[PDB]
Design a binder for this molecule. Sequence first.
Ligand SMILES: [Zn+2]
Ligand SMILES: [Zn+2]
Ligand SMILES: [Zn+2]
Ligand SMILES: [Zn+2]
Ligand SMILES: [Zn+2]
Ligand SMILES: [Zn+2]
Ligand SMILES: [Zn+2]
Ligand SMILES: [Zn+2]
Lengths: 507, 507, 503, 509
Amino acid sequence: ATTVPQVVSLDPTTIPIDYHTPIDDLSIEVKDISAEACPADEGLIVFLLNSQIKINSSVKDNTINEFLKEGNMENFTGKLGTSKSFYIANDQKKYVSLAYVGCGPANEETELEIRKVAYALVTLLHDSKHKKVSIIFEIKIEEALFRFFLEHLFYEYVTDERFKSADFIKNLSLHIANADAYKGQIDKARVYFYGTYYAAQLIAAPSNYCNPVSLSNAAVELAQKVNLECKILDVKELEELKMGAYLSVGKGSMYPNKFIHLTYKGAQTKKKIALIGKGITFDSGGYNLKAAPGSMIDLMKFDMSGCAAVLGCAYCIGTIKPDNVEVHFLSAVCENMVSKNSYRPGDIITASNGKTIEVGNTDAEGRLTLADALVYAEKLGVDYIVDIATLTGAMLYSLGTSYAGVFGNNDQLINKILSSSKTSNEPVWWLPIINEYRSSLNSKYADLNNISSSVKASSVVASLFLKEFIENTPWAHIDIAGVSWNFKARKPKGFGVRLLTEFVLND
Amino acid sequence: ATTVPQVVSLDPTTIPIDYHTPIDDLSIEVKDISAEACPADEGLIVFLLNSQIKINSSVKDNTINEFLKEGNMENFTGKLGTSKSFYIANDQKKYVSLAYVGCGPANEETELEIRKVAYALVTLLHDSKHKKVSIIFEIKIEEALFRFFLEHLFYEYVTDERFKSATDFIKNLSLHIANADAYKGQIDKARVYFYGTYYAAQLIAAPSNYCNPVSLSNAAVELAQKVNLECKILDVKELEELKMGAYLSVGKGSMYPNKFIHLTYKGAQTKKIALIGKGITFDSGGYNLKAAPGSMIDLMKFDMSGCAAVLGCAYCIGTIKPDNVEVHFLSAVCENMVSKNSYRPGDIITASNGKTIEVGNTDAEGRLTLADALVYAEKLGVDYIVDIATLTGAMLYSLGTSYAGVFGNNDQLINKILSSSKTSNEPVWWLPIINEYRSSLNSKYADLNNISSSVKASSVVASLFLKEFIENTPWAHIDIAGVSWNFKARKPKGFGVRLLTEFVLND
Amino acid sequence: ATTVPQVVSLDPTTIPIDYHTPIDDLSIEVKDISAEACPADEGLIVFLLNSQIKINDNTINEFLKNMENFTGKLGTSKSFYIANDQKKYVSLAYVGCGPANEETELEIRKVAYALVTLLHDSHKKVSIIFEIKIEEALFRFFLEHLFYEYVTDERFKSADETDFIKNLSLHIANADAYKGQIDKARVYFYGTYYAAQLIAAPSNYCNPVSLSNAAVELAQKVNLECKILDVKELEELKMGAYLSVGKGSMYPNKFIHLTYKGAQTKKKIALIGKGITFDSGGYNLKAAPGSMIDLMKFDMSGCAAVLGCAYCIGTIKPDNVEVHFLSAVCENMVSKNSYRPGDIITASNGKTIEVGNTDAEGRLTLADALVYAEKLGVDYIVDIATLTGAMLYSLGTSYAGVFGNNDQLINKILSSSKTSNEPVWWLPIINEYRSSLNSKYADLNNISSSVKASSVVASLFLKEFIENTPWAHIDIAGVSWNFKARKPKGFGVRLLTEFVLND
Amino acid sequence: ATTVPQVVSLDPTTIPIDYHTPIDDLSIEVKDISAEACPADEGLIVFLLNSQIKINSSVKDNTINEFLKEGNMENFTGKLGTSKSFYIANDQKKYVSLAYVGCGPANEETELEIRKVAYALVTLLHDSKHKKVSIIFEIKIEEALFRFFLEHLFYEYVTDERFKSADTDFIKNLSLHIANADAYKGQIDKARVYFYGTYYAAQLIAAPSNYCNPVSLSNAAVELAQKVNLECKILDVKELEELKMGAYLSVGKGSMYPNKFIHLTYKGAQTKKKIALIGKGITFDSGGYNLKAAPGSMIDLMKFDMSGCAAVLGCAYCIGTIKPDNVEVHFLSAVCENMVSKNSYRPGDIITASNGKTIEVGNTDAEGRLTLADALVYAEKLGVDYIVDIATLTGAMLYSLGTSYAGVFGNNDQLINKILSSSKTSNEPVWWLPIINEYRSSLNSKYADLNNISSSVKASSVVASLFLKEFIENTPWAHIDIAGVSWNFKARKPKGFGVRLLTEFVLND
Ligand SMILES: [Zn+2]
Ligand SMILES: [Zn+2]
Ligand SMILES: [Zn+2]
Ligand SMILES: [Zn+2]
Ligand SMILES: [Zn+2]
Ligand SMILES: [Zn+2]
Ligand SMILES: [Zn+2]
Ligand SMILES: [Zn+2]
């Protein structure tokens, strides 16, 4: 591991990462709701019900089953997110916990409803210490949405304690009709959960823990754990490659720039893919400092969410090991700071493809690092290039906090991203690259400016800028500035890991 | 002729409207580029050419035709928007004006390129006083886009002089293009579509002291008489009987009574559509006054642009008179002012459908008027309800100034709007109604709030609020807040007229 | 049309004005410091000295030759009590004036303030010894400012003749030359005091109706012709710009037009003053930090200065000059009836104006006043008005700016500024900015698209309503109100009077 | 000291400068409009005409001359900036390019109109492949404005491509036809020199701050002094500390580039006035800890905070080339960079100027006047007759005089009127603004002798001039504030404002 520079001896030198979660010690069984009815012998028994629908399945325990047949759920409505739990004596006179969780109207369940049900369920788990949990699915739910339910359940259940100064559930039974049609999703849920969990752990780490050096060290360790080729480019080689845009952003930082390049090569029993993640470990804005009201400087540790989503996907692909596919996981990591050595508003810098860029705003630094990453990616000779980045805060005013935005130059590639959004249940919406705004990026002296003089549609403008660094490879750009961080829950979502993994696997 | 209330005798009482334009005195002829070559007789001959392509057409005048054969256009390269013009003597010793206008690379022309070509060409006309103009189309262009070129040409050519304190225009226009017979059907359509846009732009550009709820409803009456449409203007008392509490609350603070415009077209019996346009003749914001930097209060005469596009569509439909269709043109017209009688932030109002609304912001008044208009429209028993409105300024940060956004509850109707966008060449993009934001509209005391507490995706939120007033009819919503007013040119676009007209005619 | 409309019975119906001041009960005499020496006697004796220069009657003329601690610096002061031939009494004071022969309007304002501070903290007989060389015009200015700082405005206090000086003696070398400036000071002081009283009057007291009634009262006191134009006459005159501004006010517009005609033994002048009794900003409301909405009663300072000069001219009554005192008075408020941002209005000369900002209303009223003044067939048109807050960032709070279309008229304003000692600085009308006032639909916009030089833009707008008459424009937005003292200066009265009397 | 420090190897180490323009390859001739009438034999012919005035000059080609006697102005008004182009066969039946250009009403042309006419014609030169051009002046212009026309023509004709990644066809022959041509022939060489001096200053200003830093800028001055043979003296930090320039040195504390004080000296041949020209030279102004973060602070354009230094160096080129007699000129600039760092000076620091006066730093973004203070002290120690400083000092200028007229302050009426006279003959507009003594107390400090800003007076341009006057004791001194006029916001380029103004001021003394 490369040594992390420190100011005082108390500065941390590694990112604490939990490579083991309570889910690793969890048994998970899918059982037919009728032919393998829940015994209700210990722990928690949760019924997932639709609005104004009564319980229809049975439990093998006579006492509990007789209570259910009374059909008295008090004021439980089945309304989405509502909950009602209580303890009751079994046939062995042990007290088990029964619970109803509402799922909304029947046949209208989407990722939204799934997340609300999983959250309400985890609220009861955090308020208890059961060893066995039984979930009775009295709802119609597709296989991929069933897997997503388990992924989100685990996401809400496992808390992050790495930065606090201060016996979980061991068996999980899932009771649903046609159980055999869902068993193939269980161990996929394990992988997708941890990849998302890994990404969130990197995003939540504060910037004094997660810096360009420690984050690159973590990618080196990751590549060894899931058996990937690993290459970390240092400043000297970056200078040789003429990555002027990427190197200029890091000038003001005490941490040297680190360009992560991991490669997965599957068994030959064809397609080559480049995944690029924005990796700004902390974005102060530069001399265009984030000082305006609402600029959320205290949350800018999450400007490497794109890089985390790529590394989380690297875990998933490195674990699943698909055949006949080659994937490169890339991220130009650095830190955007204020210093005597920082690059200034108005500076003109040269990208690795020779194009000159006038820096109209140093807080638009992400696209500068992506420009050199895109040029690097196209030089690899891949069939598709996909980048994911917390780019434009204007995403909060367009799609908002639930739906990410995808831009691209190839309709076929865009449709693959939308498909993976459906099977991963990470919502994405297609937005246009409007050529009429291109002229607002013109510069009097440089080839381009990195920000627009006239156009307020920042997300569309930023996509136009990035497009200038792809010559003729199918390319797509996913802006997760609005969806990466959950402002209400004050935690990351790990958004993008499952989306990118589905894109690689279906290809 | 309802009397317009005045404060001083100098206050105007009508909207000046030009029912006759120079296009009504212009001859338009489409001629084959080779079999009816341009004679270079008099006036202006403009060659529309692509990048790095030589002139291939011919003129019947031998002096000029010999000049063209030399193939020296100096430094004109064909780049989009560029132009070169000069005067040269023909076979009769008369000085003719020749010109080249660049249309960009070949086979890449869209509504964007066409608008730029038409603008560069009109620059030459406004710098001249020719009686005859000949446009030589050396480009590949589809019929609908060819019609659009003419519509926009006239749009840039005819200037608005109604408010200047201060015959002289072209009389013959010849269009030389290959396979000319396929384009002749478009001319009369261009004449009607142009004036529909021209008419809408005149209502929008009229200042609010001229265009108030009374004078604009008077104009709608006159329009209905000139194109034979059924007309009905609902007054305050009838609106009170219909319990339009939301619409009426917005107008409480104005010296002009509310006026609900209802025009109806019914074609020969040889589908039923409701078109709703937002009609705030001036939006001061109310007690949530538009005082923040960048709120553009001086331009808020444009908050009736939706009403203008509906009336412009009414002219087009009332003139073309299609068969087998019935269209209702609706607009709840009012004015949002500050007064002792104004409704306050925090007031709870009741809509015509019984739902109570807490007014979290008086500057979110358009959706309140549309709410009662949607209830009114659904009572008519129509097959499609489409509204168009300058709703949310957030559109400037999402799609920007070129593309309008469309929301809806019915994918088949949304796709009909998208299809109408392609054949009208008024760009529109489909944006989602994200149900996760609906709870952001909940009110502690009323059924709904009119603005969100948490979500900043203002355009999505507004669409969720409007949806609460559509019970069971296919409905679509077009947000033209970003595209209606051309900020750089300081004039309106008349956006929506041709989009909505194409919608009615196609089915 | 002459009674002030009221919302409640307690709303005031007229402006309280003090037509008599303690200065009218004060006897003033100029004595030669050498010939008729100062007779010490009993009372206050004030010494006006320069820096590092020492003083040069009863007992203390040998007290004439001690003061130490007092250096003579500008504003410094002392005190002492004396023997006398008779004996046992007085006060005697030193007050500095800074280095010798470096006295301008600034130094004398501060000297007069220090002397008034002595009087405010204390007699009936006062003597001021002028051991300084100041010319006759600045000598009158010292007495004008002394009275200005001495008379307090108590019209709006709730608390309730014997409190003031009654005899003032001024000892100065060659005193025969200054004797003529005494009565001119009395006239000039009250003209400035009168203007200040109107400006300080709150907007609920001073409104378009009560201000026009005050003009009616003033004209009666100096026999000036007075004509007040009402809405109906303004409509037939087509003053659409001026009437648009007042649409949202509960007070009807009132156009003041006084006329003075001297005895013929020639020159015709038109003086225009901006008269917005309160400027809320309209729908372009003054809500940003720094907009000073609580002080916008001073947006009729120009009208106040014009009426104050009407008093002086109506009192001095110079020969061979005809003067017209004009002010389109109104109130800029927010209401269902107010004109909106973006409205297009028609001025009385036919030009259409797009209202890019309802807080630029002053120039709309002046536009119709200028057209009105030019139709009177005069030789010079001078307007004074609190137009642009940019003046605070240009010349500041001490110097006013003057623009115009005629160099000779401008230099006459500049020379009047020198003899009136109201500082003014000449600023340019830069024609390159004219294009920024173009409107896509109207002939003109009232504000600029791109140019931030806002005081220059405003003058370009005003110029559009003068066809072919010498015209000058004085922007007093920065100098009218004394922000640290929280009172008006009455700026412009003496400047305009000097311009009229010198002709 | 001369090495440019770099953070990465890709950081530039020199300011690219075009020392050769297409104007250097263009032949220019002035011919009498009557005794040497244009032949209209080849190339492009442009007539400069006033509104509603017919063509009055003739031309040798009888076909073209016949075309001229016939109107052919059916849509040409002569309105300012309008034009009309023709292709016409001459006596030899070859097509000739001929164009009309409107200059507005007669006898009303100022620098404003001439700037628009020059722009209109650059369009025709760009849209024409003719490399021989003849301009016929059918308008009344004095010598100085005629020179200004050529200067601005060149300014708009040449483009700055030093920072484009892409990539010389220009006009080669220019004939100027005007009445009484003999009186205008001397303006040609002057316009050539005045143009490049303006062009050179605009190149230094347009250079981004990572190219133009205190080191590379002083090195450019060294190179300029060699090319034009001037004495060059660059004072480094150690000598600056010896001279006790605490104000100037405090501003650059937070920069990675060391302070560089440029001192160029011209001494004309003896056949004896001494002038000192000081330019503000902040290569980048972030504002310091008083960071430029407020809306409209234009932090992305603050590479132009050395526009004064550029105008002085551009003047040095002109004086070094023209080489007037019996004049000694000093070209000074205290160059530095105002940055945020652990080493920067803080708001509220008290620093000591080289004349002993202590200064409380009420705002670190008012650093320009602090560097000028030590530069003014240095300048008066030279014992000169006039001191003139030029600086992008107060953003308030944009609200007072605006984008077209600069402001001049000073302590000497005679020098101020010389600056105003230079403004008329250089056609760089300037307006005289007052130093109002009543605001002086607003600069007093409870602890220091002075504050660098006022907290009560908002007339910041006047206040700044009052501050600078505290560092001139007994020498005629003028101060030219070009913050509003230096940068053309609509065109997005510098003007090189001040070069010709200062050169005219030196030459006519
Ligand atoms: Zn950023
Ligand atoms: Zn960032
Ligand atoms: Zn609104
Ligand atoms: Zn609205
Ligand atoms: Zn105002
Ligand atoms: Zn005002
Ligand atoms: Zn600064
Ligand atoms: Zn500066």
